[PDB]
Amino acid sequence: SGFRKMAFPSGKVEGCMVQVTCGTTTLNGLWLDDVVYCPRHVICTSEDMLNPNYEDLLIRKSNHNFLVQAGNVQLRVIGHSMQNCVLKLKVDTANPKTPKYKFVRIQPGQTFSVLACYNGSPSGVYQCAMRPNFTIKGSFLNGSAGSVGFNIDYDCVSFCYMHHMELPTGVHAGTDLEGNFYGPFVDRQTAQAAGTDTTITVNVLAWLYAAVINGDRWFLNRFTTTLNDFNLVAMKYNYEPLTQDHVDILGPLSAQTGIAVLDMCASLKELLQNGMNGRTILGSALLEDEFTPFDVVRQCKV
Amino acid sequence: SGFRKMAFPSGKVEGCMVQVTCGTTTLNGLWLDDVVYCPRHVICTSEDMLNPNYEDLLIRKSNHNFLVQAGNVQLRVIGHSMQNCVLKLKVDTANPKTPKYKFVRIQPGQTFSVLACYNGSPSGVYQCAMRPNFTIKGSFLNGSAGSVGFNIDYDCVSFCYMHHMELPTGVHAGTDLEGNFYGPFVDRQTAQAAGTDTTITVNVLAWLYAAVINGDRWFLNRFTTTLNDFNLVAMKYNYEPLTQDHVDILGPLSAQTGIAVLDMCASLKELLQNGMNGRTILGSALLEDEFTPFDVVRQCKV
């Protein structure tokens, strides 16, 4: 037993990280088959981040202006093309370590692992969620751009995030591997800011089921609620609405614990309105919302 | 910006995990060079749980009774030995993925990355601290014994933990890689209890520094303290003693923030005597003690 924020094993992604350098600017790239993906802001210099004309910057670059190193193996670039807000650098050598993979765009509320990398070298792996306001609360220093987020299912890597930038409140914004940003953000210096964030209700319910599975059940009670009475309280506490589809998705955990979803909602309602009164749930004094139902099922097994 | 529980990249350790089966019992082993290390209770049957005599159980086993599979490769056991609570199975092939490595016995309060594995297949990675009472709070189900904990420094994997068992309170116990158990525990299914745990003071101070680096400053104040006076307060709250060597190890974080270590001690003292008044620090409503000073510098150093 036990329940922990767990990331996926990072080995399959580690062998895909490379360093991309354009002039004096270096960040990380993702080397799959004979293509290296990286944020397009690598082609800027200090006099360019204000209003970059990315189309014109890239045309004026030649293939020999991109220095791609996979460890100490130099990869020769033989084509460069725009992919929305990332670059696809074609190289002459296929990555021998390319895993089975797909590119997937994740929904707010879904989790993934992040391999934080600097200078093409992995530093750490951690788990995090795509927030409802399309940011992630990551841990990233300067040079982390091009670090990727991913899920792994039966040795297939589903890449879902590439890191681009830090917003003024310290949260992080980035794209999918098709180069489209999550949320309204742009890869320019603007006054852009994260919108107000909310709590991921279905995940908090999943985590309370995990707590029940782990023998932590002081917050269960005899009350039940309707879905709508729950959602009115949830709104008041800046929680996302719970849909019928979320209730259905919580079906497997409801069956395993014998606790109906709307009874757990009654528990959550009481926790929102009265607090924990000094108690903890799974070691936490706050309600945790970065575990999905799938994360609980995979970690708690049967 | 941002602060997350961050594990080391797991690739180097993933290539060392194998499956060891004896009869109906399966768990994980660690394959380095031509030796597989695994918990000795793989040789246990139903009648052996309360007081196994492991000398007897091992003599009743031949090299052929041990099935080792690395991926889809059967490894031939050509030798078997018991050292303390682990078994060393000599196999006929050296692991080609053996990383540069060492075996180390970690000290209480130190942290490590755990690669949780079932059937020889890594499932997840997460951070754990060796508690002062020599347990860890992990996430381990049946079949996870032989999962390892490790740190990585300059491509060298320092193995510090092999998982063996779960105590009745739901916390975890295991050995170093020479098979010596952390704490007074024994690998048998008896009523065992850990001592009351204490809080790892140097790590709380490290995390307060992480909070300051990330913009939380509300708990700072002008009071300072002696090391001696603070340690009287720590003793009163079941906090570990702070040594002068802890103070030295916090110096890089005092340097980056401008807060003298004994001033941070004064802040911690006020936090313990008053609580947080519903405020949070780095997102938590509790003081967190599972980050070492090195852990904070790894994520925060400019």
Numbering used by the authors:
A (entry chain A), B (entry chain B): 1 to 302
Quoted from the paper:
The main protease of SARS-CoV-2 (Mpro, also referred to as 3-chymotrypsin-like protease or 3CLpro) is responsible for the majority of nsp processing, cleaving at 11 conserved sites along the polyprotein including self-excision of Mpro by autolytic cleavage of its own N-terminal and C-terminal autoprocessing sites. SARS-CoV-2 Mpro is a functional homodimer of two symmetrically disposed protomers that are each 306 residues in length (33.8 kDa). The active site of Mpro features a Cys145-His41 catalytic dyad, which orchestrates nucleophilic attack at the carbonyl carbon of the invariant P1 glutamine and the formation of an acyl enzyme intermediate central to efficient peptide cleavage.
Cleavage site C8 has crystallized with the same approximate unit cell dimensions and relative Mpro dimer orientation in the crystal lattice as that of the earlier structure for C5; however, the C8 crystallographic data is defined by the space group P212121 with four protomer molecules in the asymmetric unit (ASU) compared to space group C2 and two molecules for C5. Gln189 is more extended and forms a single hydrogen bond between side chain Oε1 and main chain NH of P2(Leu), an interaction common to all Leu/Val P2 substrates.
